Every structure is written in C-alpha cells, then in structure tokens.
Tab-separated table of C-alpha atoms in Angstrom:
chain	number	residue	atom	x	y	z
A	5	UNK	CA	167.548	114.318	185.959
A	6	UNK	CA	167.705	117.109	184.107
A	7	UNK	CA	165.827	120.738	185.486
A	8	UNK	CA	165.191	123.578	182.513
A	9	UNK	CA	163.360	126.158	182.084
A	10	UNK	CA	160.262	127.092	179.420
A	11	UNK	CA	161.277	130.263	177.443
A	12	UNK	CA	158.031	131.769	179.160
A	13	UNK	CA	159.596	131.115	182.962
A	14	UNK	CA	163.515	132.703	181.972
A	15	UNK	CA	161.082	135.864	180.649
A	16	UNK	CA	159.012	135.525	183.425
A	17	UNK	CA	162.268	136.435	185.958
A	18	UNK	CA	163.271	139.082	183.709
A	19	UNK	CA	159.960	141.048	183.612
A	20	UNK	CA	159.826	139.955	187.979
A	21	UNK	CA	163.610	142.093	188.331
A	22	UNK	CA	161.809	145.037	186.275
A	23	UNK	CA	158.522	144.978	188.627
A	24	UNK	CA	161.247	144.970	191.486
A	25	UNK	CA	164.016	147.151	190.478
A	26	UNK	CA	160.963	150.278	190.384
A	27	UNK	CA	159.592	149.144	193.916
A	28	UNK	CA	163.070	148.320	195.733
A	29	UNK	CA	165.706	149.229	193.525
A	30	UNK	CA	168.239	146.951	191.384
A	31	UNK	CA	170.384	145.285	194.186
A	32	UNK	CA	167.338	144.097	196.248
A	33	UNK	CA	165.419	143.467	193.057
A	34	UNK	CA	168.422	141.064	192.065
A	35	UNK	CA	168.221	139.351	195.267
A	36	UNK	CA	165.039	138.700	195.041
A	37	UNK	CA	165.006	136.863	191.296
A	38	UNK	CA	168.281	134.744	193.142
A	39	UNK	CA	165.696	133.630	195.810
A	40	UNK	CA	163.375	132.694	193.523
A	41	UNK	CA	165.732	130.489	190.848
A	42	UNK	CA	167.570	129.336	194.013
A	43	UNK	CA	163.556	127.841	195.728
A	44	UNK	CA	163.177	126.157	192.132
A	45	UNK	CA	166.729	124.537	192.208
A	46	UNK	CA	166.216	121.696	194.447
A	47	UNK	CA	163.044	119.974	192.233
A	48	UNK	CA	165.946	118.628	190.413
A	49	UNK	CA	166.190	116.135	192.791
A	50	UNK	CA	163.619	113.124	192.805
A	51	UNK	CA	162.781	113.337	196.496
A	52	UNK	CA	161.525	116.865	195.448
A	53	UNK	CA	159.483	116.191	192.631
A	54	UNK	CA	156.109	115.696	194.111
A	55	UNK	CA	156.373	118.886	196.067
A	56	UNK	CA	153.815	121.676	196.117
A	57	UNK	CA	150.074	121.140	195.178
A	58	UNK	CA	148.428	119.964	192.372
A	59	UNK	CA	147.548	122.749	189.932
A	60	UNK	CA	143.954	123.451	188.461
A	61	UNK	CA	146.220	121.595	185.475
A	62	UNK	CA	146.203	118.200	184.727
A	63	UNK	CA	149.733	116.759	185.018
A	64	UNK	CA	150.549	120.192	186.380
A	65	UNK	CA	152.110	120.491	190.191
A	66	UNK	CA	152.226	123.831	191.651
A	67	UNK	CA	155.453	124.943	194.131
A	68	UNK	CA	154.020	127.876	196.093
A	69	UNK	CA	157.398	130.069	196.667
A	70	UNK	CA	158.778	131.543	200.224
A	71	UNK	CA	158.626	135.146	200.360
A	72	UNK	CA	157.922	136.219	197.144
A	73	UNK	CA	153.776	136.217	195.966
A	74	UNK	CA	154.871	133.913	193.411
A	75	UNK	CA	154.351	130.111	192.454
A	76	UNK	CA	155.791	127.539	189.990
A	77	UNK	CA	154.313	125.045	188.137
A	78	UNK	CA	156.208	122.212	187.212
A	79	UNK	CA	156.000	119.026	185.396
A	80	UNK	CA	158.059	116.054	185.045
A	81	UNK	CA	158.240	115.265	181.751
A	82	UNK	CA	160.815	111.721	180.882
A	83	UNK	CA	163.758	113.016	182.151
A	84	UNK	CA	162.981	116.356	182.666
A	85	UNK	CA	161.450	118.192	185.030
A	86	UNK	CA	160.267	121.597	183.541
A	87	UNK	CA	159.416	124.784	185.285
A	88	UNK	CA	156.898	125.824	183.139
A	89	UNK	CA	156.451	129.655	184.673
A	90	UNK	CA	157.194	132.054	187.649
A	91	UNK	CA	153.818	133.225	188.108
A	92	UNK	CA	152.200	135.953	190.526
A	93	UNK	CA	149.931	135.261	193.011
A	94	UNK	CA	147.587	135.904	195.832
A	95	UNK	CA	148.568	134.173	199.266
A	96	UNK	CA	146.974	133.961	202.511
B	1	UNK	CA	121.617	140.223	184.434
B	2	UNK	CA	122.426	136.477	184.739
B	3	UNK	CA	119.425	134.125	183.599
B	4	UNK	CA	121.019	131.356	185.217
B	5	UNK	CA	119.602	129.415	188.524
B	6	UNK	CA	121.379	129.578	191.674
B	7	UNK	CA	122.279	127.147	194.611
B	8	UNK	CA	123.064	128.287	198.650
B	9	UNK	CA	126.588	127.652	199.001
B	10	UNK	CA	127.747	127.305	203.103
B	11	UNK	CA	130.903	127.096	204.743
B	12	UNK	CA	132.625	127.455	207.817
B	13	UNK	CA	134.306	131.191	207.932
B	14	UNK	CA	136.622	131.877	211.578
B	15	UNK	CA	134.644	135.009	213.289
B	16	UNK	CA	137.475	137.824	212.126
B	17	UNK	CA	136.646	137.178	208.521
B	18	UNK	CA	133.242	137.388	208.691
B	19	UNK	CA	133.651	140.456	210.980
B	20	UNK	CA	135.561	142.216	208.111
B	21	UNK	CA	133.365	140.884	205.812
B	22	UNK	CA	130.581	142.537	207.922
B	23	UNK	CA	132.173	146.090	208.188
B	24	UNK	CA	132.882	146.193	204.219
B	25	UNK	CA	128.915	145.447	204.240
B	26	UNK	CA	128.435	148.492	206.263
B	27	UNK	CA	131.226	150.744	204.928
B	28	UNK	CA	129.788	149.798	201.441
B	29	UNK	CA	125.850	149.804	202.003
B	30	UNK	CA	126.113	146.345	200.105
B	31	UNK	CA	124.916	143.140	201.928
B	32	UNK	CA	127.113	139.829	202.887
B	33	UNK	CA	125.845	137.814	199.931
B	34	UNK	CA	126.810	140.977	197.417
B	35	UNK	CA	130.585	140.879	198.699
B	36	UNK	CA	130.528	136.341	198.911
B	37	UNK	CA	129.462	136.541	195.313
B	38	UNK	CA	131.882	139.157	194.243
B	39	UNK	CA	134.865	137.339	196.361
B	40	UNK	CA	134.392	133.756	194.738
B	41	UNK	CA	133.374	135.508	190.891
B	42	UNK	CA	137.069	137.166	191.727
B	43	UNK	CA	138.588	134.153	193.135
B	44	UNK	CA	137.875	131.717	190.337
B	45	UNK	CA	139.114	134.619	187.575
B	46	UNK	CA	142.172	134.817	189.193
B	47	UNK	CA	142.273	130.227	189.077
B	48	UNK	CA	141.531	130.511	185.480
B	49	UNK	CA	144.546	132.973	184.777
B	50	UNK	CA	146.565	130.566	186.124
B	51	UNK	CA	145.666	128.421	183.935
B	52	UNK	CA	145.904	130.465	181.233
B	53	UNK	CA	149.511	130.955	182.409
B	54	UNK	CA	150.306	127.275	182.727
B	55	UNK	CA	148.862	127.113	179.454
B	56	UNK	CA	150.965	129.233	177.513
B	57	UNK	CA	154.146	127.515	179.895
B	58	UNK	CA	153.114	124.004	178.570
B	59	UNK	CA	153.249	125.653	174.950
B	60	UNK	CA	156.910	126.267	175.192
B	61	UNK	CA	157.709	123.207	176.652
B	62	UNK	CA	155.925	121.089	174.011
B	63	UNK	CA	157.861	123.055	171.449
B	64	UNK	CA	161.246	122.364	173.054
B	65	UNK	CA	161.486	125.998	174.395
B	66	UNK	CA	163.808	124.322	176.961
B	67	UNK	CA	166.167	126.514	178.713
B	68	UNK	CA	168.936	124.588	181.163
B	69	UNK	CA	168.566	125.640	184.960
B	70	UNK	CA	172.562	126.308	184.774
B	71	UNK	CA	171.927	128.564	182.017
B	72	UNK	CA	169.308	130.502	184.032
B	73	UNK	CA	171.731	130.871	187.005
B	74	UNK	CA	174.770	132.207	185.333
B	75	UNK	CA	172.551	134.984	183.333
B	76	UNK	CA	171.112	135.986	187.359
B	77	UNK	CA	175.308	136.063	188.747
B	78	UNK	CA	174.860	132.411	190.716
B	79	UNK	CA	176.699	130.081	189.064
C	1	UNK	CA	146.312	127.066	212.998
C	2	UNK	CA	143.840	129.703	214.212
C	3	UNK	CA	142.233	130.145	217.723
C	4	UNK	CA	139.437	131.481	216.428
C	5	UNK	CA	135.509	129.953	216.308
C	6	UNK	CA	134.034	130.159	212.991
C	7	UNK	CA	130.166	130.753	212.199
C	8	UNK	CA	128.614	129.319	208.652
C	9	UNK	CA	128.420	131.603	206.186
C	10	UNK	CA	125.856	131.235	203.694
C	11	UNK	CA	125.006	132.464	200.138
C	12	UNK	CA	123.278	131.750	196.998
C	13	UNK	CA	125.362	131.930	193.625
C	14	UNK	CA	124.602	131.154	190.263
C	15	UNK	CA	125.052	127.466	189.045
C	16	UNK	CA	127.858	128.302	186.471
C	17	UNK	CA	130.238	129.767	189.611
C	18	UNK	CA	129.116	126.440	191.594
C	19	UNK	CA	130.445	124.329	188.707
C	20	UNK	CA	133.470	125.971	187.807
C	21	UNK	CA	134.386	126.214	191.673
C	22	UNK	CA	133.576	122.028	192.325
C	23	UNK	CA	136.286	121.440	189.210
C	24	UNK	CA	138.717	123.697	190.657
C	25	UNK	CA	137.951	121.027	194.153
C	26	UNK	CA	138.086	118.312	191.776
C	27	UNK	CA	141.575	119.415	190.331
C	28	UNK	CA	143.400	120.612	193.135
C	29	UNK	CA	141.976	118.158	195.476
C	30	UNK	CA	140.945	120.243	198.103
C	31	UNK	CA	137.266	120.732	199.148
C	32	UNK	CA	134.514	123.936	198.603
C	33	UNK	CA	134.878	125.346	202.129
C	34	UNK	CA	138.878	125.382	201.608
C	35	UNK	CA	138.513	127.275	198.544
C	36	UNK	CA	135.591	129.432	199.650
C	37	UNK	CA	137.645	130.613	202.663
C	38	UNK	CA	140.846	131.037	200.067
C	39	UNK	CA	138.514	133.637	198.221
C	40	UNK	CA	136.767	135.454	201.040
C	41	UNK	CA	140.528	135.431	202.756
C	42	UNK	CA	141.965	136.592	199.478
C	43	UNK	CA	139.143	139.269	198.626
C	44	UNK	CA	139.179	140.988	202.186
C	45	UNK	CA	143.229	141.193	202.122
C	46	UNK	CA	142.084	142.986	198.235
C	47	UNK	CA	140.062	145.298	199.741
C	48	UNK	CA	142.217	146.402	202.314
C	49	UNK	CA	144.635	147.262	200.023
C	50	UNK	CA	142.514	149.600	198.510
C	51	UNK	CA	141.950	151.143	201.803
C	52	UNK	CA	145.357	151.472	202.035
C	53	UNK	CA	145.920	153.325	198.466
C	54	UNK	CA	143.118	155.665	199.801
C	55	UNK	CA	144.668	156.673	202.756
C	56	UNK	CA	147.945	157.410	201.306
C	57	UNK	CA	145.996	159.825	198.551
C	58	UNK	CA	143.637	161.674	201.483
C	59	UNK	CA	147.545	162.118	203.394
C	60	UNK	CA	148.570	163.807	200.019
C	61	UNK	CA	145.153	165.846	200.191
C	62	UNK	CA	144.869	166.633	203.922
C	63	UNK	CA	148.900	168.253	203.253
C	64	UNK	CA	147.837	170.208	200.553
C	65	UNK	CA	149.889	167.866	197.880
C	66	UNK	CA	147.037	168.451	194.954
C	67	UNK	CA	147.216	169.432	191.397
C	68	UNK	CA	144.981	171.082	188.868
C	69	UNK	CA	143.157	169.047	186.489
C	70	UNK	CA	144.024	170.852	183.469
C	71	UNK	CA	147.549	170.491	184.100
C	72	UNK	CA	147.321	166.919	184.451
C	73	UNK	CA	145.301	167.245	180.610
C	74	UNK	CA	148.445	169.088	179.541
C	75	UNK	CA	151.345	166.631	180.721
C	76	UNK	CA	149.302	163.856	178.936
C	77	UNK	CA	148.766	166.133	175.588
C	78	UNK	CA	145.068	166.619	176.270
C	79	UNK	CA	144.609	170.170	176.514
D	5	UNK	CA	134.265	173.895	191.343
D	6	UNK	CA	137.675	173.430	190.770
D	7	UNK	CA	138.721	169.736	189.879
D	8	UNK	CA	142.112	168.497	191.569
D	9	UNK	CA	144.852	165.450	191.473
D	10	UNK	CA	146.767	164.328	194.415
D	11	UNK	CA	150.470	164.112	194.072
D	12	UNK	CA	149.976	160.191	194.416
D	13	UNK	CA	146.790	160.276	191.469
D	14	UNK	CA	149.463	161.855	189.356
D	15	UNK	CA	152.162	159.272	189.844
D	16	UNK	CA	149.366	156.376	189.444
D	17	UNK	CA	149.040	157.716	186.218
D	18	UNK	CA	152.677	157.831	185.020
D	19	UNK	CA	153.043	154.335	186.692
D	20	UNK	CA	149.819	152.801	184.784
D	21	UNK	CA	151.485	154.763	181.726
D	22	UNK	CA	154.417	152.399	182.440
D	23	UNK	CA	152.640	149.025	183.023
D	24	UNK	CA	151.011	149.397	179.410
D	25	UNK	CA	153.929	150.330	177.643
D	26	UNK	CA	155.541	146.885	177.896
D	27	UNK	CA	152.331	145.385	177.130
D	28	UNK	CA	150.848	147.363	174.539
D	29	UNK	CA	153.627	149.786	173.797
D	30	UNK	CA	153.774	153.966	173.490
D	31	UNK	CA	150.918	155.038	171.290
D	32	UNK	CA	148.724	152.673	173.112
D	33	UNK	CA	149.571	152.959	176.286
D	34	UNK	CA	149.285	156.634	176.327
D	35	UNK	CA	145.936	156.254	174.582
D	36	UNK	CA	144.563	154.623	177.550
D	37	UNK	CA	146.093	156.526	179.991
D	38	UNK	CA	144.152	159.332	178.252
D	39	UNK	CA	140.991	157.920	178.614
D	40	UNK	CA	141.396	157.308	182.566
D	41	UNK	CA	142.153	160.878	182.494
D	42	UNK	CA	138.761	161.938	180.401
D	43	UNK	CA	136.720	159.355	182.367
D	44	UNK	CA	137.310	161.550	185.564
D	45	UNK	CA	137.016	164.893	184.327
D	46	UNK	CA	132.842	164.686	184.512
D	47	UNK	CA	133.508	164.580	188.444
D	48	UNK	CA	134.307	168.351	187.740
D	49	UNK	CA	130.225	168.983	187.427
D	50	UNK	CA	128.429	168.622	190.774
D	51	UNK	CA	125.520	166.273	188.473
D	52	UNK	CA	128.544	163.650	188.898
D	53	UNK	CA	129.524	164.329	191.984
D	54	UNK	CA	127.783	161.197	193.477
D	55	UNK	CA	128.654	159.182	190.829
D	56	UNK	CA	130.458	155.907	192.092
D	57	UNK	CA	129.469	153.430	195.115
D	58	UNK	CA	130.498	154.342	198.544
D	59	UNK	CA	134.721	153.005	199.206
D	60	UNK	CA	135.472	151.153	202.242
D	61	UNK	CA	136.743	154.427	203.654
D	62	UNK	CA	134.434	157.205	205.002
D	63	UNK	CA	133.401	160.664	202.837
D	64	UNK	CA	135.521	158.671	200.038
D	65	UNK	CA	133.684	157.196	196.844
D	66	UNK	CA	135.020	155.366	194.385
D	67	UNK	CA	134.792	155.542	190.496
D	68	UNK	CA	134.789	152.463	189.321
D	69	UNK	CA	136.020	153.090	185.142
D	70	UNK	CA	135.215	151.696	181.776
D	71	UNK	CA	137.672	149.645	179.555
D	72	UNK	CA	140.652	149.735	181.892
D	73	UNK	CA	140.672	148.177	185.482
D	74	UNK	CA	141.164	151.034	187.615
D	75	UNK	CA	139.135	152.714	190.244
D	76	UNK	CA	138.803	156.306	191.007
D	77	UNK	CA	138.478	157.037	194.628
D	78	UNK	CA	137.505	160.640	195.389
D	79	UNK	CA	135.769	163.180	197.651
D	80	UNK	CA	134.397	166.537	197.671
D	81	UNK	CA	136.242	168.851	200.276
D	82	UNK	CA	134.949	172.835	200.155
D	83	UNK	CA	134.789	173.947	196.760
D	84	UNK	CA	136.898	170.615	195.366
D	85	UNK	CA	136.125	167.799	194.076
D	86	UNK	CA	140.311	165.934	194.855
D	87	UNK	CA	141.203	162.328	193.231
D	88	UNK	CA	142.626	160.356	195.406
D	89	UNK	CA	144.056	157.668	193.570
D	90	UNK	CA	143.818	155.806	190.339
D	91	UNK	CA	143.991	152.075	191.845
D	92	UNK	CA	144.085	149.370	189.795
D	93	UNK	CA	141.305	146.725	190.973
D	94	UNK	CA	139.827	143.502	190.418
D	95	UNK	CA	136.630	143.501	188.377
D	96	UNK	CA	133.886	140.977	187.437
C-alpha cells in the first residue's frame, strides 16, 4: 500500500521546523520534524493501520505522536493510506 | 448571558486534580463550578479545531493533493 | 495508572456544552467522565503555564529588567 | 505613576509580532501588535489599576484583552504599575 501525504500535512512539517528552529535552534528543530515523519512511516504497513484512536471525524483515525504535542490523522482510502495533517495538541 | 437550560454533569476526578482545581478557586476568588465550566467550554473548542483541521486535511486529499511519503523524507535529509 | 482516590466532582453546564461533549463520546468512543477528566487535566496543566510565564516576568521585575512604556510606543511607531 | 515593561513583556511582543506575520502578514500583524500595546497603556491611571481578575499568582492580576487572545498579567510595585507578560491564553 501506498502512504502520502495531503499538501496541508508536508506544510504542516514545514511551519513545525519554523516553530522549532526559534525555540531550539535548526539542528534540534530538524531532528525533531525526522521523529515525527519517521512515527508516521510505519502506517504503511497493514498491521498498522488501525492504530491510534478514532478521531471526532468520521472515517478519521487519530495517531497520537511520541514526544512531540502533536497527532496525525489518517485515513485509508483504496490503496492509500493518507496522513491528512501533523496537528498540535494538548496531552496529558 | 446564555438563555439556555442546564444539566449537573458528575464524574470521578483523582484527589490532586481537584486539589489544584481547589487552589485556582482560591487564588482566583472564582468557585469550582466557574473553573469546570470554563475547562470543558475550553476543552471542546480545542475538539472542534481539530476538526476543523482534519477538515481542511480531507480537502486536499479529495482533490488529489497527494504527496508520496518518499518524497516527504528526501525533502527532511532521510531517504 | 494512578494511586490516587478520586472524589465526584459535580457541576451544572448549559445543555448545548452537554450535547456537543456526548457527540465528541459518541465519536471517539470513549465515555463523559474520560473526557471530563481530559479537560479538567488539560485546563489545570493551561493554567499552570500561565503561572509559569508570570514568574519568569516578576524574575525580570524583582532584577530590575523593566522598560518604559513610551519606549515600547516608539519601537512599535506609536509615539 | 510611571508605566513599565519587563524585558520578557517586550520580547512577547516582538514574538506575537512574529506569529501574525505568517498568518496575516506585516501591515497586519503590526496593527495588532499595536493595539495590545494601546490596550495596556490605561493601566498607567490608578482608575485602572484594578482592572483585570485576580491571576493564579499572588499581588499579580491579569488583563484579560479585546480582539486578540492574550492576557496581561501585571502588578503595582511603589510608584509602578510593571507588565509582566503578554501571554497568549485560551478564551471562551
């Protein structure tokens, strides 16, 4: 199966380095966008795919991230699976 | 104000949350039910930005705004 | 987990916040008290932050680390 | 009474001057950092001087502004009136 990206999620990591690079600087801000594409990488496989929680979406599943306040919600979609945004959050 | 009705809402809180809860009430000089209200008014903003986020995320995909994961890796240095 | 006891929390809140917090339960398929301790959890961690932020200003006051107002009016092209 | 900014006020400033540029760009962005900046200036008379609710955080009170989500914790010391912060908050 095939794993992209919406145009939203690739700007999504872009505007997450520039929140970063201002708080940590650009090599730890890099890191931390390569943690985050590297979490989403393994909903490419079909064991994966039912991960995280049900969103307030319909057809929308929810992968609450590691480390960074961030989630992504995903949708399998034929062959895809789509990672529809990196978006901020608030964790407990 | 609202003109709205209300209902009494309950649930089980563990005692250090509603021991903070109780010394922002006092710090504050605004009651328990003040601070519930505001924290679930906040709460279910915040759920319905996410959904406005999704939203805009299902957009793009619907359009074909498709992007492949390999392409997203080389422009971040991983592959 | 936690090792904590937990008391019942009460409050009343206007039907509209009920409704739109038993569809976020419906959707996500997790109860009211989940999500009710989710935004009492979430507010109190909120408002700690701001007592955080205000600490770091008073250090900034307490070490004399203060500017005039007017000359905050002229950086921004006010005065 | 003389009316003064922390060091940290005056970086919250050129920081929310920086969050609304990418959103709203220049002109706009520096039109509404303007207005946080009026919005506190009436805490210069002591008729305003109680203005705000009580903070978490003793002798502090907090501002709570129009238009823009930001608070204004401050506190009179002597013969000033010192903001603390600009924070950005969480309104209903």
């Amino acid at each position: 199966m095939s794993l992209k990206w919406t145009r939203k999620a690739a700007a999504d990591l872009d505007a997450i380095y520039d929140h970063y690079v201002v708080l940590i600087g650009p090599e730890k801000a890099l890191k931390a966008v390569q943690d985050i594409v590297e979490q989403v990488k393994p909903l490419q496989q079909v064991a994966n795919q039912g991960a995280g929680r049900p969103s307030e979406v319909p057809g929308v599943r929810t992968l609450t991230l590691e480390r960074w306040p961030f989630s992504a919600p995903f949708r399998v979609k034929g062959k895809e699976i789509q990672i529809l945004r990196i978006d901020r959050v608030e964790i407990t | 104000g609202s003109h709205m009705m209300s209902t009494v809402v309950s649930f089980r809180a563990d005692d250090a949350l509603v021991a903070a809860l109780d010394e922002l009430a006092r710090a504050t000089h605004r009651d328990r039910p003040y601070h519930l209200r505001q924290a679930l008014a906040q709460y279910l903003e915040r759920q319905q930005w996410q959904v406005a986020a999704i939203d805009e995320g299902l957009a793009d995909a619907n359009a074909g705004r498709l992007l492949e994961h390999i392409e997203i890796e080389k422009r971040w240095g991983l592959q």
